[PDB]
């Protein structure tokens, strides 16, 4: 609605690509208000011809947990005017007791969003294999979740998967130490890398050995491109059920944090820290909420970096590959040169849809 967001949106219009790009997506929805933002901006981009979502994959749960996650994702897509994307369940991966306890997370607000319990598909990456084999052009792969199914897809038919893929975009981390053979290994601290370390190592090694370009996004890109809270109110002002859902979940998470930080329950954090990275005694939250300006969006920046059309507009990838190796580059906090236009794109292509 603001003139500058319309101007940057028409600039992006003028910077359109000639052919839409079909992307394969792996997500773990209903854990944070981020993946729903990614879905919304992907839909809005598809309506503009930039991209075209084909299939999605759910992860981070047990059989029933992942079934429910896929059901909710299908419901969100159906109510987002996207009745084409196929929802597919993942495959089982090893879990520890602590890991199982923390991966059984399921917020109650998403219970109503689940669609009819028959449209879900519980096969896996079997459908994606056929489309990848018979696709007349090249596809890109975006990973913002666990790497299990992604590792499974690239472990078979190396020639096929290297001849019909463009690049891989992942939100994760890079271990500072080089591999024994000079390759680049994922670190153990990143959440996506820590979901399944073996699958992450296999993905990185296979991608670097198969010649597929690799796109890696750190966690500080959102720090450089934080969003004001008026974005949530703007999207939810019109009574959209999805926007209401994200507003509710963000409010719930923020007030849970604000109550937890009181009475020093969480070690290493105090009231001073909250006012540092979220603002610039202990009152009610209803007065704390207006004075926040630095909320974070992590995975949408990965989707933005995946598309080469908008990659050059605001990012600046830094090469890190050895002279003899597959092209791999990392985008961090220093590579984002125009955070203002980044926030403008998030607000624009999330508000319109």
Partner 1 sequence: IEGLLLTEPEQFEEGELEYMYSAEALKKTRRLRILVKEYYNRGFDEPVAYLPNSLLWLEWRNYSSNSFPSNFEPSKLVYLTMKGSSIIELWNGAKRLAFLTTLDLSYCHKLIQTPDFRMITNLERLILSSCDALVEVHPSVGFLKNLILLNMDHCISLERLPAIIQSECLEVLDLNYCFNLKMFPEVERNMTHLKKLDLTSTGIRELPASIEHLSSLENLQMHSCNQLVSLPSSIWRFRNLKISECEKLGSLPEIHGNSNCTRELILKLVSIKELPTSIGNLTSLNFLEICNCKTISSLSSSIWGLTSLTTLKLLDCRKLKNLPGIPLDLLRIIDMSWCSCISSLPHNIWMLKFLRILCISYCSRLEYLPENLGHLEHLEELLADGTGILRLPSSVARLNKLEVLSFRKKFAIGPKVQYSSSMLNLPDDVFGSLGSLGSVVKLNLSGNGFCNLPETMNQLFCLEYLDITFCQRLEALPELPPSIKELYVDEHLALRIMEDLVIKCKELNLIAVTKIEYQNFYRWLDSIWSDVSELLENSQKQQLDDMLQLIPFSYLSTAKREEVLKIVIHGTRIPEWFRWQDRSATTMSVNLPEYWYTENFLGFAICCSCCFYHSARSYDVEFEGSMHHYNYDSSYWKEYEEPSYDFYERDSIEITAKLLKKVCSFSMNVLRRATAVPNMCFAFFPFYGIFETCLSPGDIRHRGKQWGFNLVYKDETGGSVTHEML
Give the interface with partner 1 as residue ranges (CB under 8 A).
Answer: 31-34, 91-92, 94, 96-98, 102, 105, 107, 124, 126, 133-134, 152, 155-157, 159-160, 173-174, 176, 178, 187, 189-191, 198, 219-220, 222-224, 253-254, 256-257, 260, 265-269, 276-277, 295-296, 298, 318, 320, 322-323, 330, 333-334
Please tell me the distance from the alpha carbon of residue 249 to that of residue 144, in angstroms, as a whole number. Answer: 19
Residue whose tokens read 């090893």: 94
Site string for Ca ion, 116-145 (x = CB under 5 A): ----------------------------x-
Please tell me the distance from the alpha carbon of residue 236 to that of residue 36, in angstroms, as a whole number. Answer: 13
Burial level of 162, CB count in 10 A (0-12/13-18/19+)? Answer: middle
- Relative to beta strand 165-171, strand 139-143 is parallel
List CB contacts of 276: < 8 A, sequence separation 6 or more: none
- Quote the least distance from Cβ 320 to partner 1, whole Å: 6
Q: Which residue number, 57 or 144, has a Cβ lying nearer to Ca ion?
A: 144
Task: Return the one option of partner 1, Ca ion, none that residue 67 interacts with (CB less than 5 to 8 A, by type).
Answer: none
Q: Which residue number, 16 or 198, has a Cβ lying nearer to partner 1?
A: 198
Q: Which residue number, 48 or 285, has a Cβ lying nearer to partner 1?
A: 285
- Quote the least distance from Cβ 78 to partner 1, whole Å: 25
Please tell me the distance from the alpha carbon of residue 115 to that of residue 68, in angstroms, as a whole number. Answer: 10
- Quote the least distance from Cβ 96 to partner 1, whole Å: 5
Q: Which among 31-39, 129-137, 286-294, 327-335 is the span making contact with Ca ion, rule CB under 5 A? A: 31-39
- Quote the least distance from Cβ 58 to Ca ion, whole Å: 11
Residue 28 marked as a ligand binder: yes
- Quote the least distance from Cβ 295 to partner 1, whole Å: 7
Q: Which residue number, 35 or 335, has a Cβ lying nearer to Ca ion?
A: 35
Task: Return the one option of Ca ion, partner 1, none that residue 284 interacts with (CB less than 5 to 8 A, by type).
Answer: none
Contact predicate 85/77, CB 8 Å:
yes
Sheet containing strand 21-27, strands side by side: 86-88, 51-58, 21-27, 139-143, 165-171, 214-217, 328-331, 318-319
CA distance from start to end of the chain: 13
Task: Return the one option of partner 1, Ca ion, none that residue 333 interacts with (CB less than 5 to 8 A, by type).
Answer: partner 1
Taking CA 253 as the corner, what is the angle to CA 38 and CA 336, rounded to the nearest 5 degrees?
Answer: 45
- Quote the least distance from Cβ 73 to partner 1, whole Å: 18
Largest CA distance in the chain: 62
Q: Which residue number, 22 or 35, has a Cβ lying nearer to Ca ion?
A: 35
**CA nearest neighbour of 168 among 149, 150, 148:** 150
Q: Which residue number, 3 or 176, has a Cβ lying nearer to partner 1?
A: 176
> Residue 140: in which H helix or E strand, if any?
strand 139-143
- Quote the least distance from Cβ 276 to partner 1, whole Å: 6
Residues at the site binding Ca ion, with contacts judged by CB under 5 A:
35, 144
Binding residues: 28, 35, 299
């Amino acid at each position: 609605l603001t003139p500058t967001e319309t101007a940057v949106l028409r600039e992006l219009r003028l910077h359109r690509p000639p052919l839409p790009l079909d992307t394969l997506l792996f997500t773990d929805p209903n854990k944070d208000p981020d993946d729903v933002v990614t879905y919304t901006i992907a839909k809005q981009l598809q309506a503009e011809g930039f991209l075209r979502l084909t299939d999605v994959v759910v992860t981070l749960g047990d059989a029933d947990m992942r079934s429910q996650r896929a059901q909710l994702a299908k419901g969100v897509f159906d109510r987002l005017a996207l009745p084409e994307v196929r929802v597919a369940r993942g495959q089982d991966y090893p879990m520890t007791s602590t890991q199982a306890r923390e991966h059984s997370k399921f917020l109650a607000e998403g219970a109503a969003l689940r669609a009819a319990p028959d449209a879900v598909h519980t096969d896996g990456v079997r459908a994606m294999r056929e489309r990848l084999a018979t696709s007349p052009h090249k596809l890109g792969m975006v990973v913002i979740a666990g790497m299990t199914d992604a590792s499974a897809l690239l472990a078979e038919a190396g020639d096929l998967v290297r001849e019909k893929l463009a690049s891989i975009t992942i939100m994760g981390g890079i271990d500072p130490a080089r591999d024994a053979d000079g390759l680049v290994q994922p670190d153990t601290r990143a959440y996506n890398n820590a979901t399944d370390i073996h699958a992450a190592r296999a993905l990185y090694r296979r991608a670097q050995q198969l010649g597929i370009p690799l796109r890696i996004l750190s966690k500080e890109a959102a720090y450089r491109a934080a969003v004001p809270p008026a974005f949530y109110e703007g999207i939810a002002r019109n009574g959209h059920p999805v926007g209401e859902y994200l507003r509710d979940v963000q409010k719930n998470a923020l007030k849970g944090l604000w109550e937890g930080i009181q009475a020093n329950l969480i070690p290493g954090l105090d009231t001073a820290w909250f006012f540092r990275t979220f603002v610039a005694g202990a009152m009610s939250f209803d007065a704390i909420w207006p004075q926040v300006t630095k909320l974070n969006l992590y995975d949408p920046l990965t989707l933005l970096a995946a598309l080469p059309g908008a990659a050059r507009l605001l990012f600046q990838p830094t090469p890190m590959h050895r002279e003899g190796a597959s092209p791999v580059e990392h985008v961090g906090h220093a590579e984002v040169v125009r955070p203002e236009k980044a926030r403008l794109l998030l607000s624009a292509l999330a508000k319109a849809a």
